[PDB]
Design a protein around this ligand. Structure first.
Ligand SMILES: Nc1ncnc2c1ncn2[C@@H]1O[C@H](COP(=O)(O)OP(=O)(O)O)[C@@H](O)[C@H]1O
Ligand SMILES: [Mg+2]
Ligand SMILES: [Mg+2]
Lengths: 274, 117
């Protein structure tokens, strides 16, 4: 489980996140398979925590852990060629129909429900972090912000002083930094909105919420986002999205965490439509 | 522009909504004014005319824009655990308007008259 830095290929780059960079490598015979290596891209203590989380997870709809490259530390994992839904959906708009989207929504819920069974809250469930293995299979990655809820507690309060994808976050996360399992359910409804809009930039969660908010900048954007959610305003029904699917999407956006649906009820909801 | 910091506590969120509520009451709060837009409104005002607006930085809430001898400038309002403080000062206040009422009596005499809408 220990890869040597002297045999890494460093082919090209795969994708850049808000916290790190991912590159494609292989490890003169070229007998090594393709692997995705995640570097720090300036911190060092957070990447070690992310590796310990990924090595603890083992699910069909979660990116498989591979190894570690010492020096600094680099994370090695399986390489999914189709990238993320943020890149796969805009390129296959006429290929992925509604039934295939609902199939993706079921796989994401089964992966998130398993993640919740291990007291883990993802805290960054978005289409850019849902990797695509094939046309019929997707996996969940990016656990840099994942936190573990204590077995006797119902949520985990964050004192990280780090940036957060606020346009995917529930009101309790924005106002108090509290993260329930229901907080990931909120993020799923936003991610489901991305999946149905094929990750269109003009219909992104940020662009639509900024339209509802109006002129804003700075950290006061968070304040105005909370006030917009307090007014009962949510992302609209995507075009060509049936009412039965949008109702399940609205169940994820209840202001109260206790009023939101669970992942197991979402699986039963989407499976009833297939 | 994608990521921000969530509020660290309900008390912190109550502090900012309390300040935003008081700022909407006064006439010299302009909300989402940029640095260039605020300085254009202040360059022709008498020296010492100040203004309250939202900061443009991700990690800051409010900022003050005043006209000094060299023209319109801007100062950050640091917020930490319900306390407000200026970027170049060590005086903390539990209220934003107590911070303003203090520097209206400061020996520096930087702020004197507010620019109303
Ligand atoms: N194993 C992988 N296979 C294919 N693409 C990947 C893989 N890992 C990461 N990526 C790409 O890298 C991008 C960002 O990776 P991620 O680790 O989520 O960033 P960060 O965690 O720094 O925010 C994603 O959009 C994804 O497309
Ligand atoms: Mg990411
Ligand atoms: Mg990340």
């Amino acid at each position: 489980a220990h890869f040597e830095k002297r045999f890494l290929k460093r082919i090209r780059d795969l994708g850049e996140g808000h916290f790190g960079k991912v590159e494609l490598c292989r490890y003169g015979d070229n007998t090594g398979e393709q692997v995705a290596v995640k570097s720090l891209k300036p911190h060092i203590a957070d990447l070690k925590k992310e590796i310990e989380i990924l090595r603890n997870l083992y699910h069909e709809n979660i990116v498989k852990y591979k190894g570690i490259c010492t020096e600094g530390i680099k994370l090695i994992m399986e390489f999914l060629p189709s990238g993320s839904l943020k890149e796969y959906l805009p390129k296959n708009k006429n290929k992925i129909n509604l039934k295939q989207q609902l199939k993706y929504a079921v796989q994401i819920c089964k992966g998130m429900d398993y993640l919740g069974s291990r007291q883990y809250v993802h805290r960054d469930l978005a289409a850019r972090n849902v990797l695509v293995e094939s046309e019929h299979q997707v996996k969940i990655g990016d656990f840099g912000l994942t936190k573990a809820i204590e077995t006797d507690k119902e949520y985990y309060t964050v004192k990280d002083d780090r940036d957060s994808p606020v346009f995917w976050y529930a009101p309790e996360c924005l106002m108090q930094s509290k993260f329930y399992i229901a907080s990931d359910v909120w993020s799923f409804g936003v991610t489901l909105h991305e999946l149905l809009t094929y990750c269109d930039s003009d219909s992104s969660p940020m662009a639509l919420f900024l339209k509802m908010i109006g002129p804003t900048h700075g950290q006061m954007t968070v304040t105005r986002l909370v006030n917009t959610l307090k007014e009962g305003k949510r992302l609209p029904c995507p075009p060509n999205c049936p009412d039965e699917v949008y109702q399940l999407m609205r169940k994820c956006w209840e202001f109260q965490p206790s009023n939101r649906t669970s992942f197991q009820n979402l699986i039963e909801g989407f499976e009833a439509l297939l | 522009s994608t990521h921000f910091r969530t509020f660290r506590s309900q008390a912190d969120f109550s502090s900012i909504t309390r300040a935003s509520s008081l700022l909407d009451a006064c006439g010299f709060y302009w909300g989402p004014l940029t640095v260039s837009a605020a300085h254009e409104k202040l360059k022709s005002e008498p020296e010492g005319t100040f203004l309250i607006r939202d900061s443009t930085q991700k990690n800051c809430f409010f900022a003050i824009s005043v006209k000094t001898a060299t023209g319109p400038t801007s100062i950050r309002i640091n917020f930490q655990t319900g306390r407000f403080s200026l970027d170049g000062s060590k005086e903390t206040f539990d209220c934003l308007f107590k911070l303003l009422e203090h520097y209206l009596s400061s020996p520096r005499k930087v702020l004197v008259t507010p620019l109303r809408k």
